[PDB]
Design a protein around this nucleic acid. Structure first.
Ligand SMILES: [K+]
Ligand SMILES: [K+]
Ligand SMILES: [K+]
Ligand SMILES: [K+]
Ligand SMILES: [K+]
Ligand SMILES: [K+]
Ligand SMILES: [K+]
Ligand SMILES: [K+]
Ligand SMILES: [K+]
Ligand SMILES: [K+]
Ligand SMILES: [K+]
Ligand SMILES: [K+]
Ligand SMILES: [K+]
Ligand SMILES: [K+]
Ligand SMILES: [K+]
Ligand SMILES: [K+]
Ligand SMILES: [Mg+2]
Ligand SMILES: [Mg+2]
Ligand SMILES: [Mg+2]
Ligand SMILES: [Mg+2]
Ligand SMILES: [Mg+2]
Ligand SMILES: [Mg+2]
Ligand SMILES: [Mg+2]
Ligand SMILES: [Mg+2]
Ligand SMILES: [Mg+2]
Ligand SMILES: [Mg+2]
Ligand SMILES: [Mg+2]
Ligand SMILES: [Mg+2]
Ligand SMILES: [Mg+2]
Ligand SMILES: [Mg+2]
Ligand SMILES: [Mg+2]
Ligand SMILES: [Mg+2]
Ligand SMILES: [Mg+2]
Ligand SMILES: [Mg+2]
Ligand SMILES: [Mg+2]
Ligand SMILES: [Mg+2]
Ligand SMILES: [Mg+2]
Ligand SMILES: [Mg+2]
Ligand SMILES: [Mg+2]
Ligand SMILES: [Mg+2]
Ligand SMILES: [Mg+2]
Ligand SMILES: [Mg+2]
Ligand SMILES: [Mg+2]
Ligand SMILES: [Mg+2]
Ligand SMILES: [Mg+2]
Ligand SMILES: [Mg+2]
Ligand SMILES: [Mg+2]
Ligand SMILES: [Mg+2]
Ligand SMILES: [Mg+2]
Ligand SMILES: [Mg+2]
Ligand SMILES: [Mg+2]
Ligand SMILES: [Mg+2]
Ligand SMILES: [Mg+2]
Ligand SMILES: [Mg+2]
Ligand SMILES: [Mg+2]
Ligand SMILES: [Mg+2]
Ligand SMILES: [Mg+2]
Ligand SMILES: [Mg+2]
Ligand SMILES: [Mg+2]
Ligand SMILES: [Mg+2]
Ligand SMILES: [Mg+2]
Ligand SMILES: [Mg+2]
Ligand SMILES: [Mg+2]
Ligand SMILES: [Mg+2]
Ligand SMILES: [Mg+2]
Ligand SMILES: [Mg+2]
Ligand SMILES: [Mg+2]
Ligand SMILES: [Mg+2]
Ligand SMILES: [Mg+2]
Ligand SMILES: [Mg+2]
Ligand SMILES: [Mg+2]
Ligand SMILES: [Mg+2]
Ligand SMILES: [Mg+2]
Ligand SMILES: [Mg+2]
Lengths: 76, 7, 272, 46, 95
RNA sequence: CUUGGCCGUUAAAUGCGGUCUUGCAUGAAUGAUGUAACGAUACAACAGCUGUCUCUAUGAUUGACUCAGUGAAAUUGGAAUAACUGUGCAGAUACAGUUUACCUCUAGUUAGACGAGAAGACCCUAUGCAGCUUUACUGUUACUAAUUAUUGAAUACGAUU
RNA sequence: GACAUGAGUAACAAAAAAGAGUUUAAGGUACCUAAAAGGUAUCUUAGAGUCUCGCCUAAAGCUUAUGGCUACGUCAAGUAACGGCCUCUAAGUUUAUAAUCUGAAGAUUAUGACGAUGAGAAAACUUUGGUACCAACAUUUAAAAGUGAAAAUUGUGCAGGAAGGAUAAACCGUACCUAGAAUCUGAAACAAGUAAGCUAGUAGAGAAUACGAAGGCGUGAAUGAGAUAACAAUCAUAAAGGAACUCGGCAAACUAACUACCGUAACUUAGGGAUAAGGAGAGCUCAUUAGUCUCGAACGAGUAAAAAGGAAGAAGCAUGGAAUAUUGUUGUACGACUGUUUAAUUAAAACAAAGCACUUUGCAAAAAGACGAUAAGUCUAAGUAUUGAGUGUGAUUUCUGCCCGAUGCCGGCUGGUUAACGAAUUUUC
RNA sequence: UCUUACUAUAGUCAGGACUAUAAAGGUCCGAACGGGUUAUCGUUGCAAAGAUAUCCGAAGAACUAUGGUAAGCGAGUGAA
RNA sequence: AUGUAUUAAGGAGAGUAUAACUUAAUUUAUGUUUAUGAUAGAGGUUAUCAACAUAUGAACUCUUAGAGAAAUUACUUAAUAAACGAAGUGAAUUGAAAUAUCUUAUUAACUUCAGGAAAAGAAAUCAAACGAGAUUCUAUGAUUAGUGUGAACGAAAAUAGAGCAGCCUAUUAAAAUAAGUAAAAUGGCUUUAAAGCUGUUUGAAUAUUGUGGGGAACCUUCCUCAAAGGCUAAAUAUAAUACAUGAGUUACAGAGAAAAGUACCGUGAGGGAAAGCUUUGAAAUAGUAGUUUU
């Protein structure tokens, strides 16, 4: 079983609660099974990886800018 | 507390 | 069986200290001692044991008829191998048919008034020392069970009672069928021992005793004052009971109808 | 002054003193729950 | 403790005999020496039929527009016990 | 009273130890009294030892100091906030008179600002409190004593008359 | 509530400690270059790592608890190499049942249930009461030897040392942190505090003392670099003197541990005092060897064997060479003593204490004493006058005198008094 | 869940010395550990009780851990 | 805040189409009216472009079987908060300028029992020589009568209004008309000394052909009522929801709560925030500029 981090009901407001835990199971197969390798970054165009990567970095920087502010700092 | 006392 | 629980610390079922100066002693076990001795027949003393929760010594006897073993208060001088018998449930046939008569007050005493034998106080002749005197016709022994204690038979009555002088010197009326073991309670040298140190008292479940003079006026009638002061206050207990002067703590409505000659009060005079 | 009285504190004793079963199963404990419930508390015990 | 002590105690916080299940069900009984014998009368199985040749899929073409059933004059249209019995006679009378 | 007299200890003894004791106001289980042993108890002396001192000096590290970064607190009616003598709610940076002083910082220092901190524990007040005490006032109990009731007899013995 | 002052001041000093290279990602500048790009160097933010140096080390290390506002891909039928759940019960708990007591609430006793800090089959395959018991202490034992556990064996002292049950693999826990370097408790990133196992080696009687292999660390710029005033802290040394200081030898210094070493006073409860005091020896090198061990062949040789060893020798200012163990003696007061006490201003002469003494308790249904809105009832105690409770004193030597008037308690008359009760009376409307 | 006492189940005390014992001692020296004697520092402290040195006990009336019990009309607990 | 209407067990945990709420978390049908409504198209996720009324599938876990460390175990078609009501028990602060009786006060609080309300209730009541005609709520009577040393405490008749309902054959099923009762002494409560309640010890009578109780010490005549047996709606108390009104509030106001009994504090009982919007931008305060003085 994998526990979950305790959190407030509305993120930063509400009572402190804990979501339901997660249960993972590992079966010892009788016949082997191998997963395929993920496509190369230059071959994920069917999923719009180009646009999704730009949005991820934009959100990635937004979380780093907030982390700097949470420390009581500002980007010179 | 203060030790100065005019007892 | 083991002696454990908060009662070892002086607490009752409520959890509060009802007996002061108790707790912290050595782990003990209670010995089931036989104070009635109804089963007749010869009993062989296997060994004289030491009882922690008792002043005298206990003897592990063995019933030669069934082999059952039991404990009894050992007499002064009783050793392993000695044979004891309890004539409380009546006299045996072999002893009754020997004389032939209904009762022979002479020979019965010569064969049954032996050290360690339990007999009714009526079957014991006058002047004999006993140490397990009973009270009721079918009650266990209650008097003179401590070490070195004994009682003498003063006179007998046709009557339902017999007079005996207890260890305290009280000549009182005892039942006719009351049990009594001939001899003296073993360990006669118990009241001569000296502990030697405070730690030996803590092993015996005895905790320190604080004097009333050492407390404040709030927790004792003797407390208060500057320096060592009794306070012009007559000695009393922490609850107001006189501790000296002769105040009897026996209930007045409970008159002792079995007392023939009451104890001799010393009246505060020095003995030595 | 205040003392560090919660040092070495176990959560087994938190449930035996201020738990929920220690109140629904007692006469005085039902008042605490009924009081905290009338006030609107979410944490009725422990 | 200050605040974490005020959360709901879980099995991942204490070990001194604190046990709490996940409502997985009872599959047997405990023994007097700490083991577990599974009673297969309580174990549950999953009856999955043979899907070979089955043509129905979980989606229906959007060309077939949704249409609800009509039961004029009947308040308990779909739940009418009479239309089920009368329909049973003509279609299947034996069973 | 008093550093009581005397003897020993000190070059010098209001101390300590011994003794004399006419003890403001010692005393026998509120125990009296003398040893061995024990003591982070208290007092006094000796030997050794030393920067404790005569009398301080030098050296080391960390602070103090400067530069760069981060960044408090008590405190504060407002201040252009000198000295003396006098004055005055009676101890003046601020009033009177005289004197002195170019403007502004830094590191030291603590004489004053009756400096800061805590609506003084001392003392007194209030027909204010709390605990304790007792032969304070008024009360409640433990406990003791008599008796109706639950509860009926029999002799007596005797006294009222 | 906002914003000033102090003040851009204090502070970022656990006496471990840092120095010089390398390097990744993202971004900001300068130049090359004007086809955008890319390259070189540099700065910022978040990292990683190499060499050298130092600190901790019976830890500031590793493995795990209590716990957790650190983080969620942490994986077990059982043993070796695992706990819980489950079974059994202790101290106790009970809005369970019955009985009893009780102004209600409730309380009591029995039984049941529940309750670990304990006990639970086998496995490198597995499913009666000393004929005793598994408290403390000591002893012996897996046969090459030594050491440390497990369990057992035997014995010793008194303080006399649990209970109960037996005998084809579900569910829950498994991450990370252990407090000197980012996580627990102390309001916090606090020089404090917190459980168990392991915790290299040298050297020692030792877990002391010194070094420190591995490991970790030398903090989140919560800092870094300089200079080395006064003064402060923490230290080192010191001419001559050696308590002249001071309330007072406060502090500091002297002393110190070791040996199977010599010696040791008054006094004494005969045990002590005593490790008294006061002296002697110590490291390196070596002659020498009864046995043990080794090598060669009884004997010979050997310390590249453990030990023994001496009035032997060498060198230096010095061989308890560095670190670790804080003086000796004497006369009194108080308390016998070991102990305990105002957590966080008084550790003592106070409290306790063994001992001593007095009062109290006969147990026939309640021993007295304590507790019980108040009882049943509980401790006392499965005790019995050599028992228990209360009071004072405070081991032991030598002793403890006079007064029973006052006060208290105890006992006592065919007594006086004597409320209720009541013979005999007496009124208002 | 601090603390005082009691209670149940458990755990810890290097090494050495003296003593009648191989083991019988509120014995001795001294770590862990537990106390907190004196002194200095600190006092808006690292700390609303700390740091360093010194000192005391360290087989016992010892210390420690996990549970349990007794406290707020009467006073729980109290080597006071 | 008040008023009116309706209603009569409340919360939490976790999960889920983040207007949609329970693992079916946006179920499936009927009727009418649909712009003269109600108060001749496009659109099934590019969704719900339809309101009203009546039905309907689903609706987990805990409180809430037993146990336990609530949301677990193990079982199973196991399931009811607070406020208000009656009785029992029953203080103190305070006032008296101290303080005992008294007052605070038949108060607060606690315990038991009960329902959507409960309790009470159809005169052994009051009146005064005339008469009224159950209970309950509100006002007047009344800072009255009266008690109390005082301080203070404090009725009833009657009146007005809200409601109105009487009965035993009770619209729910009860009486053969009530004896250890009325009453007395004594110890208390209440109170004006009566009446009423009550522990202890004692202890009656039988209807206006004048038996019993009451009419405020007590006796007597008269009047009045008929105890020791019962049923009874409404007006009333509390909570929830909705609506109406406002010289009520408009964000340090109004509820503590415009996202709240949440965050946070405390071992615990318990204590308990801040925070609206796109508008306006005062004072203090800070760095500068202009003029001016130093
Ligand atoms: K964990
Ligand atoms: K001592
Ligand atoms: K003045
Ligand atoms: K100054
Ligand atoms: K398992
Ligand atoms: K009761
Ligand atoms: K010193
Ligand atoms: K030498
Ligand atoms: K004393
Ligand atoms: K004394
Ligand atoms: K006298
Ligand atoms: K007398
Ligand atoms: K202590
Ligand atoms: K009046
Ligand atoms: K009356
Ligand atoms: K009637
Ligand atoms: Mg005692
Ligand atoms: Mg004593
Ligand atoms: Mg004592
Ligand atoms: Mg005192
Ligand atoms: Mg007193
Ligand atoms: Mg005196
Ligand atoms: Mg405190
Ligand atoms: Mg603790
Ligand atoms: Mg944990
Ligand atoms: Mg368990
Ligand atoms: Mg005396
Ligand atoms: Mg600076
Ligand atoms: Mg002047
Ligand atoms: Mg002026
Ligand atoms: Mg200064
Ligand atoms: Mg001024
Ligand atoms: Mg300054
Ligand atoms: Mg400065
Ligand atoms: Mg500085
Ligand atoms: Mg770059
Ligand atoms: Mg059980
Ligand atoms: Mg366990
Ligand atoms: Mg720390
Ligand atoms: Mg540390
Ligand atoms: Mg912390
Ligand atoms: Mg060490
Ligand atoms: Mg570490
Ligand atoms: Mg560094
Ligand atoms: Mg010198
Ligand atoms: Mg010199
Ligand atoms: Mg001098
Ligand atoms: Mg001088
Ligand atoms: Mg030389
Ligand atoms: Mg002493
Ligand atoms: Mg103190
Ligand atoms: Mg001290
Ligand atoms: Mg003596
Ligand atoms: Mg009794
Ligand atoms: Mg005398
Ligand atoms: Mg006399
Ligand atoms: Mg009378
Ligand atoms: Mg505790
Ligand atoms: Mg010792
Ligand atoms: Mg300072
Ligand atoms: Mg010692
Ligand atoms: Mg020691
Ligand atoms: Mg249940
Ligand atoms: Mg359930
Ligand atoms: Mg009225
Ligand atoms: Mg007056
Ligand atoms: Mg009638
Ligand atoms: Mg009556
Ligand atoms: Mg009358
Ligand atoms: Mg009447
Ligand atoms: Mg009248
Ligand atoms: Mg508000
Ligand atoms: Mg506004
Ligand atoms: Mg403005």
């Amino acid at each position: 079983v994998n526990q979950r981090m305790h959190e407030q009901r509305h993120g930063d407001v509400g009572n402190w609660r804990r979501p339901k835990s997660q249960k993972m199971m590992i079966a010892e197969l009788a016949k082997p099974f191998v997963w395929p390798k993920p496509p190369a970054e230059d071959a994920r165009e069917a999923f719009d990886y180009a646009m999704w990567k730009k949005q991820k970095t934009a959100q990635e920087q937004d979380t780093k800018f907030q982390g700097i502010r949470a420390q009581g700092e500002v980007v010179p | 507390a203060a030790a100065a006392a005019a007892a | 069986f083991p002696k454990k629980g908060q009662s070892k610390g002086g607490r009752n079922h409520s959890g509060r200290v009802t007996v002061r100066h108790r707790g912290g002693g050595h782990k003990r076990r209670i010995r089931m001692v036989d104070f009635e001795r109804w089963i007749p027949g010869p009993h062989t003393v296997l060994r004289i044991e030491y009882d922690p929760g008792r002043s005298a010594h206990i003897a592990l006897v063995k019933e030669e008829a069934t082999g059952r073993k039991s404990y009894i208060v050992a007499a002064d001088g009783m050793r392993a191998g000695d044979v004891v018998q309890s004539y409380r449930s009546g006299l045996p046939q072999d002893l009754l048919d020997s004389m032939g008569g209904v009762v022979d007050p002479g020979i019965l005493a010569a064969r049954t008034c032996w050290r360690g034998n339990c007999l009714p106080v009526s079957m014991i002749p006058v002047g004999t020392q006993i140490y397990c005197v009973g009270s009721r016709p079918d009650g266990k022994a209650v008097f003179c069970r401590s070490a070195g204690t004994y009682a003498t038979i003063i006179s007998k009555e046709t009557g339902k009672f017999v007079n005996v002088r207890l260890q305290s010197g009280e000549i009182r009326r005892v039942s006719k069928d009351a049990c009594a073991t001939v001899g003296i309670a073993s360990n006669i040298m118990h009241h001569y021992r000296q502990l030697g140190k405070a730690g030996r008292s803590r092993w015996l479940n005895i905790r320190p005793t604080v004097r009333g003079l050492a407390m404040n006026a709030n927790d004792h009638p003797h407390g208060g004052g500057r320096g060592k002061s009794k306070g012009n206050r007559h000695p009393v207990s922490p609850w107001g009971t006189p501790a000296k002067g002769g105040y009897k703590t026996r209930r007045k409505s409970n008159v002792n109808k079995w007392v023939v000659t009451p104890r001799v009060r010393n009246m505060g005079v020095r003995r030595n | 002054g205040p003392r560090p009285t919660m040092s070495g504190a176990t959560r087994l004793v938190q449930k035996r003193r201020h738990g929920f079963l220690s109140r629904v199963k007692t006469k005085n404990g039902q008042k605490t729950l009924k009081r905290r419930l009338a006030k609107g508390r979410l944490r009725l015990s422990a | 403790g200050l605040k974490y002590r005020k959360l709901r105690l879980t099995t991942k916080d204490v070990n001194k005999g604190f046990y709490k299940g996940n409502r997985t069900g009872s599959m047997g009984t405990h023994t007097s020496y700490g083991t577990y014998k599974i009673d297969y009368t309580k174990v549950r199985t999953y009856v999955c039929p043979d899907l070979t040749g089955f043509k129905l899929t979980p989606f229906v073409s959007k060309t077939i527009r949704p249409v609800h059933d009509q039961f004029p004059g009947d308040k308990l249209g779909p739940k009418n016990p009479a239309t089920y019995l009368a329909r049973w006679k003509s279609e299947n009378g034996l069973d």
